[PDB]
Structure formats: C-alpha cells, structure tokens
From a paper:
Many acr genes form an operon with genes encoding transcriptional regulators, called anti-[name]-associated (Aca) proteins. [name] is the most recently identified Aca family that is suggested as a [name] by controlling the expression of acrIC7 and acrIC6 in [name] and in other analogous contexts. In conclusion, [name] from [name] is a dimeric DNA binding protein and a likely transcriptional repressor of the acrIC7-acrIC6-[name] operon. [name] forms a dimer in solution and the dimeric form is critical for binding specific DNA.
The diffraction data were collected at a resolution of 1.76 Å at PAL synchrotron. The crystal belonged to space group P41212 and four molecules were present in the asymmetric unit (ASU). The final structural model contained most of the [name] sequence (residues from S3 to L60 out of 65 amino acids) for all four molecules. The structure of [name] showed that it was constructed of an α-helical bundle fold comprising four α-helices (α1−α4). Analysis of the surface electrostatic potential of [name] showed that most was positively charged, whereas one face composed of α4 and a connected loop was highly negatively charged. The AB dimer was a symmetric dimer, whereas the BC dimer was asymmetric. Since DNA-binding proteins, especially those recognizing palindromic DNA sequences, are typically symmetric dimers, the AB dimer was the more likely biologically relevant form. The PPI, mainly constructed by helix α4 from both molecules, was formed by multiple hydrogen bonds and salt bridges. Salt bridges formed by residues H30, E52 and K57 from each molecule were the primary forces maintaining the integrity of this dimeric interface. R44 in the connected loop between α3 helix and α4 helix is a critical residue involved in the DNA binding, which likely results in a high degree of DNA bending.
Numbering used by the authors: 3 to 59
Write the structure that this text describes.
C-alpha cells in the first residue's frame, strides 16, 4: 500500500478547507503528527490516508 506524498496530503486538506488540527482530529492523531506528515518527516500510514479521504469526501 502506497503512502501519500506530502504534497498530496496538503492538497487534499486544502481542498476541503480544513485546518491541520481539524485534519489530525479526523484521523485520531496529534497536530504535530499531521505537521510531520506534511513536512515529509514521517510517512502517513496508508490506512489513515484512506480514512481521511473517506471522511472528507
């Protein structure tokens, strides 16, 4: 399963007008974790990526 690119994560969050905190809450994660995902510091678990897409579309 492919992890999303950081730019894809940011684009998907911006598409639904969510703050980083709101996105993190949607996937039961911390704000710092979402920031690390968008910075490329950590890879986003593909299941959490799927959850985010399911809950925002």
């Amino acid at each position: 399963s492919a992890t999303p690119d950081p730019a894809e994560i940011l684009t998907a969050r911006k598409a639904v007008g969510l703050s980083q905190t709101a996105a993190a809450a949607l996937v039961h994660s911390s704000l710092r974790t979402w920031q690390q995902w968008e910075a490329g510091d950590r890879r986003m678990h593909p299941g959490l990526w799927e959850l985010f897409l399911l809950k925002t579309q």
